[PDB]
Paper text:
A key group of these are the respiratory chain supercomplexes (SCs); these which primarily consist of complexes I, III2 and IV (CI, CIII2 and CIV) in varying stoichiometries, which serve as the minimal functional units for NADH:O2 oxidoreduction. Here we report in situ structures of porcine respiratory SCs, determined directly through imaging porcine mitochondria by single-particle analysis combined with cryo-electron tomography (cryo-ET). Our in situ structures also capture numerous reactive intermediates within these respiratory supercomplexes, shedding light on the dynamic processes of the ubiquinone/ubiquinol exchange mechanism in complex I and the Q-cycle in complex III.
CIII2 transfers electrons from ubiquinol to cytochrome c (cyt c) and contributes to the proton gradient for ATP synthesis. In addition to the apo form, we resolved four distinct Q-bound states. In state I, the Q10 headgroup is situated near the [2Fe–2S] cluster at a distance of 10.8 Å, with the Rieske domain exclusively adopting the b position. Focused 3D classification uncovered a less-populated (approximately 13%) Q-binding state at the Qo site with its headgroup shifted around 6 Å closer towards the ISP compared with the dominant form. We propose that this state, rather than the dominant class, represents a transient electron-hopping phase from QH2 to [2Fe–2S] in ISP. To further analyse the detailed conformational changes among these states, we measured two characteristic distances, one from [2Fe–2S] to Q10 and the other to haem c1. Our results indicate a possible sequential progression from state I to state IV, characterized by increasing [2Fe–2S]–Q10 distances and decreasing [2Fe–2S]–haem c1 distances. On the basis of these observations, we propose a model that outlines the coupling between ISP movement and Q-binding states.
Residue numbers in the entry:
A (entry chain 3B): 21 to 438
B (entry chain 3C), C (entry chain 3P): 1 to 55
D (entry chain 3P): 326 to 379
E (entry chain 3S): 12 to 109
F (entry chain 3I): 32 to 78
G (entry chain 3Y): 2 to 52
H (entry chain 3E): 79 to 110
I (entry chain 3A): 2 to 222, 228 to 446
Write the structure that this text describes.
Amino acid sequence: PQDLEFTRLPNGLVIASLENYAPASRIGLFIKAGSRYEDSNNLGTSHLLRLASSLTTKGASSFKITRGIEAVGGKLSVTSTRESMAYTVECLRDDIEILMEFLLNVTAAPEFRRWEVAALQSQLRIDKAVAFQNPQAQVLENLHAAAYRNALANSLYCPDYRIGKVTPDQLHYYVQNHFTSARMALIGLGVSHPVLKQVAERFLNMRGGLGLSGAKAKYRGGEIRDQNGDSLVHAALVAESAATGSAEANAFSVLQHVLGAGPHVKRGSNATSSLYQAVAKGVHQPFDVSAFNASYSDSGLFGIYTISQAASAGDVIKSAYDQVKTIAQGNLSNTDVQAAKNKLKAGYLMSVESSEGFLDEVGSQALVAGSYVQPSTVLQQIDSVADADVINAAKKFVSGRKSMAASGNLGHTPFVDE
Amino acid sequence: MTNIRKSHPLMKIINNAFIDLPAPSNISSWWNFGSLLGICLILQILTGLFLAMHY
Amino acid sequence: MTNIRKSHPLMKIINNAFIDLPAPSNISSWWNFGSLLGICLILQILTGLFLAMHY
Amino acid sequence: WMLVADLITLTWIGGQPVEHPFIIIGQLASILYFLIILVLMPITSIIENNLLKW
Amino acid sequence: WLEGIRKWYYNAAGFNKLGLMRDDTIYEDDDVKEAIRRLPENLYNDRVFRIKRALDLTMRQQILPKEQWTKYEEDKFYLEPYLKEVIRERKEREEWAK
Amino acid sequence: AALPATSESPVLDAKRSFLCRESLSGQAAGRPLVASVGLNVPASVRY
Amino acid sequence: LSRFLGPRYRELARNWIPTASMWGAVGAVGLVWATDWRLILDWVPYINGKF
Amino acid sequence: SHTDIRVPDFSDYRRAEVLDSTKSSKESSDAR
Amino acid sequence: ATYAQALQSVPETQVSQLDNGLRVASEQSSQPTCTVGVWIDAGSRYENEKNNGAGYFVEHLAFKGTKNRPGSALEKEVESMGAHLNAYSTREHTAYYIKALSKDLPKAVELLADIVQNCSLEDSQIEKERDVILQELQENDSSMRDVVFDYLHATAFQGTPLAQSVEGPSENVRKLSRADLTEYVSQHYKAPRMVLAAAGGVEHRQLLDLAQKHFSSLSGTVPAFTPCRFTGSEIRHRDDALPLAHVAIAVEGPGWANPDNVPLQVANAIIGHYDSTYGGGTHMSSTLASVAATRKLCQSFQTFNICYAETGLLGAHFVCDNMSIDDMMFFLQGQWMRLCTSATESEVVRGKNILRNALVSHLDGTTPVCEDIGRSLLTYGRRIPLAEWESRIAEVDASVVREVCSKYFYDQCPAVAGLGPIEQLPDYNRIRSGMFWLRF
Ligand code: HEM
Ligand code: HEM
């Protein structure tokens, strides 16, 4: 019953709602105000804004916000990528109105009071330390710094030299220049369109224009290597693949799943993954290789990510790379292409089944594409990809400026020129 | 909020004195006499007062 | 290695109760009475004892 | 200062015996001593706060 | 008019004679330290210097010259907007408590 | 979050060791990092 | 002060009335026992023989 | 490993009621 | 759709029963994916001292080759159609579920029939897996959360099979041979102790036909566990080199039965959870969490509700520095007895809403739904509909919470497990004294 009804508001807003009659309803305001829009004098402002939820707003105080959100037992989670933040609220379908009001207060009329921001600035260090306990965070941040020059190079987290110096005026300027009515998508799962339109007319009336336009993220090709000392060397070598939502993007995703992207059977052997088989014939020590695909609006990054022991790291970098070269000259079995397409179609459908995953997918579709395509359309697009495109893919990855980020005991890790 | 035993200065002194004072687990019975002395002292004082009220 | 005044326990208490105690700069003469009462108390005790030895 | 003067008045009254000139003065002094502490001082503080724009 | 009585009481209080302002003499109840903490840097520095000067004057039992007295119309209620917010937050917490 | 996520945030604490090939399976990021920290929910990262 | 009272405080009072009343009974019994309060002790059956 | 450690037997100190592994102790908690 | 109508609109879980005793059950939906898996009643609770760890070993070996499917060929299938094969073995449950597409159910069930019936137990593969399990045990030794929870289980159910860990001691791991593994799988992986759950876009009749076509030749138509005993004790693995100090304090809670679970969860929902990277901080309704955020006593704390078939552990687990264990023990016990003696109505309403959100939001996506189906047909004996959960939560009030907390918390001997710089941790007598209030 019901369908994902889509209506773009005259302001520039796009409201899409799906009444699935679920016991709980979620609402996500997706704002195209990620970390790619931070300039050099305001880095980390987006991070604090991500932690700036629950601060005293214009209509609801911080105490009122927290007590109202959690007395119902609801949600207020900010999910931020390099290009788009997303505020999300979740509660029973009976108490959705209060959650919507709180979300709109925290996303449309924030105060950023001086004492509140000053107290909150300590949480930046804790968030960075907790996130960076996973080495993949450091590796990916270094990769983005060493791959893109200006726009996407900004980290998802506030650099240590800006912790404590994020003035409230910076937050106000960021909101006024990026939280615009033409850069957002109020997506509702478990609600009805008229209700979502009333809240759209409730406040939702910022400058309405397209805000401060970003800059085209130029490619760098640099190499950032840090020696943190932990035994497990994480390395990642990428090249500029293509912008998201393109034929080359689909070809690169198919190539990612051909190479292998994560495990399927828990504690298996990744037999289908060509990279894992190619590397395993070399190093006989605990390792893990996987194709790393990133697809942003303006450009993308396709490469290989290898966790390996310090001594063997170079071999893991070499043989795996050679494996990709094997595809570049053309060694792709059509059976492998079909298997990768099946894996892609599955992974997509099993990512959409979850309510949260559905919400994020629709939010990304609304922000980037501007419309919504049913899963059948995406599956047909994936099926339309031919083997020759996957062969482009390999040639483009092989012949290009390679940005590499490494972390660990880098005593033997090869450099970009090696 | 703070625990009154560990925040009230009088109760803080009492707590550090004989509530949460780290004491060895293997002190023999011979240490009890210390307290006994104090106890005796207290008893003495009481009795002394009731003797000074008719002497 | 450290001043006895703020390292010896009894000396530490005396120091941070009568020597290095931060007091307001403009307390008037009335505040002085707080001391006088205490002195009076001692003068009441020390003299009083000497009456108890012939009373 | 009226309270202090009332205290000296009470001291003097207690010094004197209990006759017609002193009984009424003692009653008034006791009533005033309680009234200043419990009634006059708080209400006066309210008046001052109002008079000083807070 | 009532403003005449307010002026008379302001002159009779005498805290202007010390160079102080109204919000410089408020008793620091539990709300007051929180209100002070939220003050901007410049206001806090001016407040602390003014109070230090007042204590200096009272230690010598002296007052500012007649020229440097905070006139009743120049007195500013710098703390009042912050104190109102602190009191309102406390009231809201109390109302949610009951 | 009625649910307290899964893994909480022990700052100033060591991560889960490794040292087995199976336990190191698919730890290689394949999608861009995204961070999720919000009111009444532990912070998380996903790649 | 008027800051108290309201919804939450009345059921707190109701919950703690049984315990407070039992403590009051404890105090009453301890008082009558401690001072050997005659007035009550010529009524309880077995202790009447004390006097 | 943490799994290698096991609580040593206290059977000579335990009360008679709580002494059998195949019987809950909540019933005898009130008595003890 | 006023919530209650939405709860009624949730499709039901049809339940069948094969002649072999297989409790085939399915919940039909419209999603194009599915999660089908068998839940077996094996686990460490049914493992003796010598057999301890055999369940984990057989779970390891399950996916690494079968009889009909030799080795990675089985895996070759799972990745070929995009399926995600996963497993987990609790102290009383085991499960192997295969995420797949709705059109791959005929094959996926087949794979499951191969995993649980025609296993391999290859001796060389056993040798390769033994060192892998040893290294996994070493990895878990650094898991200061799992280690603490295993310490709590050992010190609470001492002298009973429930004290045993899932992986088992390393001695048993190295000693275990193929004969023990095949004996274990033949004794515990019996048809009456298995439930073939399948959530998502699977029609129940198709599931029944598949199960009858594949799982037919299982066991015909016995470890039934022994009632374990709770023993209030404490384990102190004092290790000051560890940065933080994990502490877990529990009391004998209820089981899967004993509806007192529903009010009790509400009480836990009142205490809630918190860590450093949270939101409101010193505003959340939980007095424990508000105080923790105000004074920065800890980096984390949680309230668990580990409940087994006949008993269970109810309590909290907090991670804090060495200088704040006493303060949080004080505050946690204070909150417990505040709920015990005067729980108020508003906090009960908040707990009811939080529990409602937990049950509702937890059951989204095919994997949690299938897991709930498989776990409920084993523990409760019936997939409890969300409407029944709503009614049971509704019946809970302030008096019920006070009574149930008095039954399970007041004047009870707890089980404590501390690991790290736990010197501050109050002695067991002080904790037990905190388990009762003199004022009340
Ligand atoms: C340090 C503790 C004390 C000790 C060791 C102590 C010792 C003694 C001794 C040995 C006697 C003689 C008893 C006799 O011969 O019958 C005595 C008598 C007396 N003490 Fe103390 N005393 C102490 C504390 C006090 C105090 C504090 C007072 C006053 C309040 C006091 C007042 C008296 C009086 C009045 C007598 C005479 C009554 C009598 O001798 O029986 N005593 N004391
Ligand atoms: C709190 C402080 C004290 C006060 C206010 C106080 C008060 C008094 C007063 C008013 C008198 C009557 C004096 C007279 O009428 O001649 C007196 C006498 C006496 N006091 Fe104190 N006193 C105090 C401390 C002490 C102390 C500490 C002792 C014991 C050492 C003591 C022992 C005596 C004695 C023995 C007498 C009788 C001597 C006489 O006839 O004056 N007093 N006291």
